[PDB]
Design a protein around this ligand. Sequence first.
Ligand SMILES: O=P(O)(O)OC[C@H]1O[C@@H](O)[C@H](O)[C@@H](O)[C@@H]1O
Ligand SMILES: [Cl-]
Ligand SMILES: [Cl-]
Length: 321
Amino acid sequence: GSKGRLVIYCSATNVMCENAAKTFEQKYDVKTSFIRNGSGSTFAKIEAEKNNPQADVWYGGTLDPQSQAGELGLLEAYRSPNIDQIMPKFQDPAKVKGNLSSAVYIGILGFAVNTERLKKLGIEKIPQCWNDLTDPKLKGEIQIADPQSSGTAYTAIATFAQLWGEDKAFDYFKHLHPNISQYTKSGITPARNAARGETTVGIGFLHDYALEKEQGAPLEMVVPCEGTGYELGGVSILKGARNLDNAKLFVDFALSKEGQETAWKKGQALQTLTNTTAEQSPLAFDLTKLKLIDYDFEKYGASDERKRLINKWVDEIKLAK
Ligand SMILES: O=P(O)(O)OC[C@H]1O[C@@H](O)[C@H](O)[C@@H](O)[C@@H]1O
Ligand SMILES: [Cl-]
Ligand SMILES: [Cl-]
């Protein structure tokens, strides 16, 4: 009873990806496989493969590189009927309109603190603001990912540019740098290392920290006092997808009540869902309760900002010097 196939480039966590693929395969009899890689890493792969695309759909990870892929003609437009159920402000959020990319979840940018480690290091108060993370007492005690690979890291750079302006954002990263022990390849690695007690502060998306906390890690999550940004998780069909009808079916599924709910019910992924008919995890953040910027996906999900800010970060924040 096999009904074709589907290849997914996934940029969410392995557990979320595997659950989505298995659930889709069992529901629709589509032989479904995925390859997981960072949001930025996946963008580069898709761009390199554009003359002979090797996947059908790009699922999860942050919207900005999917929006950039749309701008560059790497995607195939498709508006799912399930867009009707998506939070109106997020129905068609990318730079090029027409649902070349669609929003499947929301992740809040912030940081979390291993409180056992903070204590075991002699620091009395938990950082509450982005500003607090440049405190010299945190030298070598913070981790964040590298935006060459990680969507999360780019969401942070773009958030900081939107909060403070680009110049002061790069001032901030200059001051944050001495406190970073490791720039990680994956967005989620600071959460894992903070949970493990290998680092004291991780910067990333708070739902990853919430999952670690739910599993017993001594973490305190912080929505920084100045305000913060967020990812939209993206789903996009690749231009030249060999399995186009099945790709459209997967976009429908990813935007559906069932497909989104299964992320937190079975896929160990606690992002806030964009489908207004879906039940949220009790652990999901509620956007109406948070000090969030109006994150400009049209502006930051574009080559000018993504190439320019990432190359600027590489040049100044870690190379020289
Ligand atoms: O930063 P990246 O490696 O691109 O990954 C980004 C992804 O990271 C995960 O850990 C989060 O659960 C996802 O919500 C996010 O989309
Ligand atoms: Cl993973
Ligand atoms: Cl197909």
